[PDB]
Write a structure and sequence with these properties.
Largest sheet of chain B: 2 strands, antiparallel
Helix content of chain B: 40-55%
CATH superfamily of chain B: secretion proteins EscU
Radius of gyration of chain B: 13 Å
Helix content of chain A: 40-55%
Structural class of chain B: alpha+beta
Subcellular location (chain A): Cell inner membrane
PDB class: membrane protein, protein transport
Strand order of the largest sheet of chain B: 1-2
Family (chain A): Belongs to the type III secretion exporter family.
CATH topology of chain B: name from scop
Protein name (chain A): Surface presentation of antigens protein SpaS
Distance between the termini of chain A: 22 Å
CATH class of chain B: Alpha Beta
Strand content of chain A: 15-25%
Strand content of chain B: 15-25%
Shape of chain B: globular
Order of helices and strands of chain B: EEHEHH
Function (chain A): Involved in a secretory pathway responsible for the surface presentation of determinants needed for the entry of Salmonella species into mammalian cells.
Oligomer: heterodimer
Number of strands of chain A: 1
């Protein structure tokens, strides 16, 4: 699958995600 | 990019300025959204802001003075919103 454990971790540690 | 996903890290205990934690487009953007939803990290669909952070910043930058005030407003807003729901 397409998200590495690094990015998963980065998401977990974010306050928010801004999206379009 | 037809989809964009920008992540904001903010922990003032550690560091005063927020950071671009996540930076992805298209499929990877869709997967970031699905993963934040799964894992409970809030997703704010703000087209102008997504678009301009995408243009101005890169993964692991600090948020620059150009966009800092807008990002800070989003962060305060999110905190207020959490607090409104934290007592109910």
């Amino acid at each position: 699958e397409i998200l590495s454990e690094q990015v998963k971790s980065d998401i977990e540690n974010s306050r928010l995600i801004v999206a379009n | 990019p037809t989809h964009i996903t920008i992540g904001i890290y903010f922990k003032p205990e550690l560091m005063p300025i927020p950071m671009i934690s996540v930076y992805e487009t298209n499929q990877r953007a869709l997967a970031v959204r699905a993963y934040a939803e799964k894992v409970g990290v809030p997703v704010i669909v703000d087209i102008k802001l997504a678009r301009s952070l995408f243009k101005t910043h890169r993964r692991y930058d600090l948020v620059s003075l150009e966009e800092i005030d807008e990002v800070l407003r989003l962060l305060v807003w999110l905190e207020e919103v959490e607090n409104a729901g934290k007592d109910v």
